[PDB]
Amino acid sequence: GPSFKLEHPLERRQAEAARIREKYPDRIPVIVEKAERSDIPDIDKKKYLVPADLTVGQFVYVVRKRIKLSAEKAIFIFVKNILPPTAAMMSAIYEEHKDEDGFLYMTYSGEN
């Protein structure tokens, strides 16, 4: 389930956000974690630095490449429990939903 804030206090999270946003000024730092109630498998990687104009849909494909699911099985990515538009830019999602720490938090699930 969501664990990044469990495992790191605000100060460490903000410091990592500041560090990475200085090093990659045009990228959006995204934390992708399993939805609390889903039994879907683990994804290979939690932390993604995405181009600001990547679309949500392009990002869903990125995430789907880092999980092993039988071909009939669904995946969904949410931002604060909202299903974002595949045509939206990640920059717009970030503006609407970024955390106080500087990251964008998203969850993935086998259920919608």
């Binding site: 990475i20 990659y24 932390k47 630095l49 990002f59």
Partner: peptide, 5 residues
């Protein structure tokens, strides 16, 4: 460790 997309 960040995945550069």
């Amino acid at each position: 460790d960040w995945e550069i997309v």
